[PDB]
Design a protein around this nucleic acid. Structure first.
Ligand SMILES: [Mg+2]
Ligand SMILES: [Mg+2]
Ligand SMILES: [Mg+2]
Ligand SMILES: [Mg+2]
Ligand SMILES: [Mg+2]
Ligand SMILES: [Mg+2]
Ligand SMILES: [Mg+2]
Ligand SMILES: [Mg+2]
Ligand SMILES: [Mg+2]
Ligand SMILES: [Mg+2]
Ligand SMILES: [Mg+2]
Ligand SMILES: [Mg+2]
Ligand SMILES: [Mg+2]
Ligand SMILES: [Mg+2]
Ligand SMILES: [Mg+2]
Ligand SMILES: [Mg+2]
Ligand SMILES: [Mg+2]
Ligand SMILES: [Mg+2]
Ligand SMILES: [Mg+2]
Ligand SMILES: [Mg+2]
Ligand SMILES: [Mg+2]
Ligand SMILES: [Mg+2]
Ligand SMILES: [Mg+2]
Ligand SMILES: [Mg+2]
Ligand SMILES: [Mg+2]
Ligand SMILES: [Mg+2]
Ligand SMILES: [Mg+2]
Ligand SMILES: [Mg+2]
Ligand SMILES: [Mg+2]
Ligand SMILES: [Mg+2]
Ligand SMILES: [Mg+2]
Ligand SMILES: [Mg+2]
Ligand SMILES: [Mg+2]
Ligand SMILES: [Mg+2]
Ligand SMILES: [Mg+2]
Ligand SMILES: [Mg+2]
Ligand SMILES: [Mg+2]
Ligand SMILES: [Mg+2]
Ligand SMILES: [Mg+2]
Ligand SMILES: [Mg+2]
Ligand SMILES: [Mg+2]
Ligand SMILES: [Mg+2]
Ligand SMILES: [Mg+2]
Lengths: 116, 136, 52, 66, 177, 188, 75
RNA sequence: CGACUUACCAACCCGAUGCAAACUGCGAAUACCGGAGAAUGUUAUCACGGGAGACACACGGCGGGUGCUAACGUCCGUC
RNA sequence: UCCUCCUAAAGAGUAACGGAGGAGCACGAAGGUUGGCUAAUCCUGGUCGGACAUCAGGAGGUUAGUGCAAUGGCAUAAGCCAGCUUGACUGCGAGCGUGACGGCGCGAGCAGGUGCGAAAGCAGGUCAUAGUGAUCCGGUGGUUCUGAAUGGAAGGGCCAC
RNA sequence: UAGUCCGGAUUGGAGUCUGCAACUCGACUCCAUGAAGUCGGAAUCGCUAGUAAUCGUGGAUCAGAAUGCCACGGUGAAUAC
RNA sequence: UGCCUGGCGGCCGUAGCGCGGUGGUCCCACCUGACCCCAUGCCGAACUCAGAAGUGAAACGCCGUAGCGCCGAUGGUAGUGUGGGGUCUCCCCAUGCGAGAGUAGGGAACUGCCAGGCAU
RNA sequence: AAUGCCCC
RNA sequence: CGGCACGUAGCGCAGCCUGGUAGCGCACCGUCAUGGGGUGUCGGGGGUCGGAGGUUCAAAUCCUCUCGUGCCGACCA
């Protein structure tokens, strides 16, 4: 039910983003992995997804659940988005504290170009 | 003398008494006294009918009182003008619609129940009738 | 009716002032806040004072 | 564990009359002398002497008889 | 940590062969030992509560949390929000150190120890017990102390029933009986 | 200072009629057949402490006053003034000779005595009903030929004089009722 | 000891379903959020749902709790 | 200090039966708001200006409060 | 005089010396923001301790709570806890609601200048509805706007008890 | 200078003796237990010298059963205007 | 493409509970450890951080099951608009609308985007 | 030269 | 009828305003004094607020309803 706790933590900001109709960048941090994907303002369709389950990153990395891996997948997702033409998003920490791995992903994305 | 132990509010609107009745099935006992008319029974009339029927069966069998006076009826005093707030509660009443079974009884033969209900109904302002239990 | 009203005079040298109420009994210490002062269009500290 | 909040907590030696030495971390500060530890307490050879049931007719016939 | 190593090496396999467990994760393991000292006299004297807190910080290795009146009860002239207790949670190496200290020093030192109950077990395995004098812990000295306090221990386990919790403490040769 | 009307105030109110605080003790409202209504109030002058009788007109009326009473505790006397304090606000306060009239001999120290203050200022203090006091002076009682009880005059550490039975000597604390000025017991 | 009612507050729905609406016009006046705000509509400090764009009012029943939603179809 | 017997009362739950203007896990007919269309209607609609009167109503039907489901009673809504 | 429910006839409104209750405030945090948390009550085990304190677990599910009456609402919590703060800002205001009128209420958005947040953003008081008194007359501070020949001033005006 | 190495009441256990017989109801001994009591309210009592105060001893009664009663000595005062 | 698993939805109980069974290659969860980032009104419990020895026990997912919950009739049985009538406090007739509860039954959800393993 | 009542 | 102000130990009264303790006098119990009774002295005990329901953490106290006892008038017709 830690799941339900953090989902309740996320729900408010998620619905505010829903209402503002902004393209939101969501993360989802597990112990052994970290994910990211930008989802169209309607919320049902996803634009680009970058994850540390992908071989293209899992090979370059040494351990998957740590801050440098988070920065790597953040770089990956911001690059894929900017290539697809998306450059203005909003960050949806999806319940996790904006700190450590998630903050690292966010800084890497900001650095790679995603204005938010 | 039946009367609610507590009520949320002391006085109640007059209201109307339209429609048929709800508890129109003899369920508990084997015979019942179904009302055919329509009006309002009082706690006094209910108690009088109960006394009549229980004495007629001589403390035998089991009876049920399927109605309960919850409506508080109020009256103004005498020689008082017509304004100046609602009255004050005098007695309690149970509105009756056609078909509402009033009393129930089992454990006594059918004819003895007939007589007991006759002696009871002779003290009720509503026209009533005897009804028996039915399957389904 | 225990809650008197006060004026928060500006510390920007003007005579501008707001006006609110304070419970003089439980909070005897003066009220100091930073409110917008429109005569100089800055946020300056405001120090309370008597209505007079 | 915060820094200045909690008290000192160091490894302290505890010696009993059972002849058992025990290295324990505790707040006692100095060394420690025990009188009774777990292994010496009269708990497993005491459940009879700490009740003392006995029998009065036995006491009587031992006191005297026919 | 001596008792913890002992647990990991003997007790897990002993409980395995005892209860015919299939996964090692099934074996009951303790999680926290909670220490509580409810000082009702604190509303009369707060310095009493402070001294109780100090004694608890002595008995354990941690500063205690000052519990406060959840509700306002007139039967004891406590108003909601009053500081009336102390609490210490012990997890990990601190829990194991206090557990060892307890069952090896304090239980033998308690006055007229004829054994602890085998039926104070919450029905859910979690054991709890109480002491009547805080001097039974060698950390505090009876010439230094002024008032004799008490407290109660609470051994929370992941035992489904209480039979397996008691069997766990027995594997730890807890001195209850 | 909400103005009060005659057929409104019952006992307990502190009316302020004619630059002077009062205190309604009793009041009888009358509405006779065919005439203006009135109230016969049994007022109480709250400064000299005399009970005045006033028949008030339905219409005739008066403003209220800040006369209030609560439990102050005596501290000390200095010159012509008596100082007391609260146990729930700890607000300091000073009275005068007029307020403490004839209760000077009843208050010792730390006595918890109800005081009436008006305009945020005391006007009358009420000594606790029973006060423990010590006797400064007495004539060693000698029964002599007394056949009845006899009694004996005895000054106290605060100047007062009370009749004490016969045995109370000097340095014995007694208990007196401020209300009657009389001996109750010798507190051991 | 009675007869002290209060002034009627004129709550209720002001623009019903499928009704053209300029931005800033009240749709419902209420006490609590009996109707919640949806697309292009706001929620005042006293829970009056107003319009934030022009278009046609629509009433919805979306939600996991089966709540009532006011939305504006921006036409 | 422990207690043994048992003609009464019985909360909480479970089954069954009713009641409510200030009860609602349901819920119409009408009425009300908005849009579209044909026919009809001496613009019947709205705005601005000149002139008013009137603001004691009554009874009959329908929905009610009060009264006694009394009054050619009384107070409302609608015709 | 004002607020809440019913009467009130499923839009709004609707009377009676009809049925029930409340208000004439409180708060500089009980406001703003960011982060986090989820109750009442029962059962069991537990030092004094007990019907009921504090501790632990379980069942339960918002029967709890909301500064204050009742109604509607509240879990994204509007409830509870903590950090930083003063948006309890100034000038306006598309457009609506509600009034015979005096008026009263809601409000996105613009400009200046702040607060919290990494940011998206939120903030011109408080879950909402009671907590109030028109005009005259006069007081206080500001302000060149006027100032009875002229320069001042008195006194008026404009802005904020 | 402490409810104490004061006080010994009460109670548990174990015994001795007298006596047909120590349960109701003896006395004494041993071990343990260690109440109240920190100089005593109004009132009240005895005593003028080997007296009061204090310390022991014996006897009658009597198998056993006295802190009572009757005697004996040891130390030995204050005051009487 | 077929099945598995993650996230974000759509929908808001025919979608939820309960009982039985089952899942660890991957994913997930528990897990290991704690100087460092960070944290406890005490507690690495939680929140974090550094990892991968063990386990699917708990949780989570999935399959089954009709003990509940839930849905629910075409269709048949109260009220009511309009007109008329009566024995008029309450009903009837013509006409239009037509429930609530209950019955038969249904029911162990359906689906969109993008991501990781066997066949192809 | 304070008080001091009564006894079927 | 209303309004209204009472109901607290055996009796008579306080308290209540401004919530957290129930007080005062007489009486009552046991000594003492006395030949004995009384006066007197020394000590002791006793109630929980007519009742019920609310507000509250908590009600003698605050609200509301009941029961009982007093007081005022229930007039112009
Ligand atoms: Mg009926
Ligand atoms: Mg202001
Ligand atoms: Mg458990
Ligand atoms: Mg209804
Ligand atoms: Mg209507
Ligand atoms: Mg025309
Ligand atoms: Mg006109
Ligand atoms: Mg009319
Ligand atoms: Mg009649
Ligand atoms: Mg309406
Ligand atoms: Mg009208
Ligand atoms: Mg009022
Ligand atoms: Mg939040
Ligand atoms: Mg308990
Ligand atoms: Mg509730
Ligand atoms: Mg808030
Ligand atoms: Mg406008
Ligand atoms: Mg509010
Ligand atoms: Mg005027
Ligand atoms: Mg004038
Ligand atoms: Mg002026
Ligand atoms: Mg000029
Ligand atoms: Mg001039
Ligand atoms: Mg001027
Ligand atoms: Mg001594
Ligand atoms: Mg002898
Ligand atoms: Mg003692
Ligand atoms: Mg003599
Ligand atoms: Mg002589
Ligand atoms: Mg002698
Ligand atoms: Mg002798
Ligand atoms: Mg002899
Ligand atoms: Mg001698
Ligand atoms: Mg595995
Ligand atoms: Mg962890
Ligand atoms: Mg690995
Ligand atoms: Mg159904
Ligand atoms: Mg049908
Ligand atoms: Mg009809
Ligand atoms: Mg149906
Ligand atoms: Mg299932
Ligand atoms: Mg006589
Ligand atoms: Mg006349």
């Amino acid at each position: 039910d830690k799941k339900s706790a953090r989902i309740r933590r996320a729900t408010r900001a998620r619905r505010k983003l829903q209402e503002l109709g902004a393209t939101r960048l969501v993360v989802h941090r597990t112990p052994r992995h970290i994910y990211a994907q930008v989802i169209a303002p309607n919320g049902s369709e996803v634009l680009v997804a970058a994850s540390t389950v992908e071989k293209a990153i899992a090979e370059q990395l040494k351990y998957t659940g740590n801050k440098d891996a988070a920065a790597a997948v953040g770089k990956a997702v911001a690059e894929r988005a900017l290539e697809k033409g998306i450059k203005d998003v909003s960050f949806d920490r999806s319940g996790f504290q904006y700190h450590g791995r998630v903050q690292a992903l966010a800084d890497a994305a900001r650095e790679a170009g995603l204005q938010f | 003398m039946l009367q609610p132990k507590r009520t949320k509010f002391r006085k109640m609107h007059k209201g109307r008494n339209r429609g048929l009745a709800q508890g129109t099935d003899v369920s508990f006992g084997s015979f019942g006294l179904k009302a055919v008319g329509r009006g309002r029974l009082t706690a006094r009339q209910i108690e009088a009918a109960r006394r009549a029927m229980t004495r007629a069966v001589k403390r035998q069998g089991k009876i049920w009182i399927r109605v309960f006076p919850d409506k508080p009826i109020t009256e103004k005093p005498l020689a008082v003008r017509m304004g100046k707030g609602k009255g004050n509660v005098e007695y309690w009443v149970a509105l009756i619609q056609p078909g509402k079974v009033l009393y129930e009884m089992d454990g006594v033969p059918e004819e003895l129940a007939r007589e007991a209900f006759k002696l009871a109904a002779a003290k009720l302002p509503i026209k009533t009738t005897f009804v028996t239990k039915t399957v389904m | 009716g225990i809650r008197e009203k006060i004026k928060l005079v500006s510390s920007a040298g003007t005579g501008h002032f707001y006006t609110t109420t304070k419970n003089k009994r439980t909070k005897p210490e003066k009220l100091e806040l930073k409110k917008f002062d429109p005569v100089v269009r800055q946020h300056v500290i405001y120090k309370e004072a008597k209505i007079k | 564990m915060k820094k200045d909040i909690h008290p000192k907590y160091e490894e302290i030696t505890a010696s009993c009359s059972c002849g058992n030495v025990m290295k324990i971390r505790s707040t006692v500060g100095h060394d420690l002398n025990l009188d009774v530890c777990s292994k010496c307490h009269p708990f497993f050879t005491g459940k009879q002497r700490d009740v003392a049931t006995g029998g009065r007719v036995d006491r009587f016939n031992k006191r005297f008889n026919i | 940590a001596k008792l913890h190593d002992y647990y990991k090496d003997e007790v897990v396999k002993k409980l395995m062969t005892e209860f015919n467990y299939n996964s090692v994760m099934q074996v009951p393991r303790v999680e926290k030992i909670t220490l509580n000292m409810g000082v009702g006299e604190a509303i009369a004297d707060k310095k009493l509560l402070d001294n109780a807190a100090a004694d608890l910080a002595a008995i354990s290795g941690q500063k205690p949390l000052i519990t406060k009146a959840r509700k306002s009860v007139a039967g004891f002239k406590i108003r909601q929000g009053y500081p009336i207790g102390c609490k210490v949670t012990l997890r990990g190496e601190r829990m194991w150190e206090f557990f060892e200290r307890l069952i090896t020093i304090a239980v033998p030192r308690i006055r007229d120890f004829r054994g602890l109950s085998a039926k104070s077990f919450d029905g859910r395995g979690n054991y709890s017990m109480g002491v009547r004098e805080q001097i039974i812990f060698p950390e505090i000295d009876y010439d230094k102390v002024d008032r004799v306090r008490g407290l109660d221990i609470t051994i929370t386990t992941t035992a489904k029933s209480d039979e397996e919790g008691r069997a766990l403490l027995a594997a730890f040769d807890f001195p209850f009986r | 200072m909400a103005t009060y009307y005659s057929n409104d105030f019952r006992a307990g109110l502190k009316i302020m009629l004619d630059g002077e605080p009062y205190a309604v003790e009793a009041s009888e409202f009358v509405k006779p057949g065919k005439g203006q209504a009135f109230a016969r109030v049994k007022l109480r002058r709250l400064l000299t402490g005399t009970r005045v009788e006033k028949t008030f007109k339905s219409t005739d009326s008066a403003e209220g006053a800040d006369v209030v009473d609560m439990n102050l505790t005596y501290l000390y006397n200095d010159g012509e003034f008596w100082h007391f304090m609260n146990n729930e606000t700890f607000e300091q306060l000073s009275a005068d000779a007029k307020a403490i009239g004839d209760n000077a001999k009843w208050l010792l120290d730390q006595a918890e005595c109800i005081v009436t203050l008006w305009n945020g200022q005391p006007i009358s203090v009420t000594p606790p009903n029973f006060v423990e006091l010590e006797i400064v002076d007495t004539d060693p009682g000698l029964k002599g030929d007394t056949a009845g009880t006899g009694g004996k005059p005895a000054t106290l550490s605060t100047g007062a004089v009370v009749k004490v039975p016969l045995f109370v000597q000097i340095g014995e604390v007694i208990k007196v009722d401020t209300r009657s000025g009389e001996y109750v017991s010798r507190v051991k | 000891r009675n007869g002290r009612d209060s002034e009627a507050k004129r709550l209720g729905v002001k623009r019903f379903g499928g009704e053209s609406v300029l931005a800033g016009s009240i749709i419902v006046r209420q006490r609590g959020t009996k109707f919640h705000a949806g697309a292009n509509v706001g929620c005042g400090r006293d829970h009056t749902l107003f319009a934030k764009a022009d278009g046609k009012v629509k009433f919805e029943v979306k939600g996991p709790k089966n709540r009532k939603f006011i939305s504006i179809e921006a036409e």
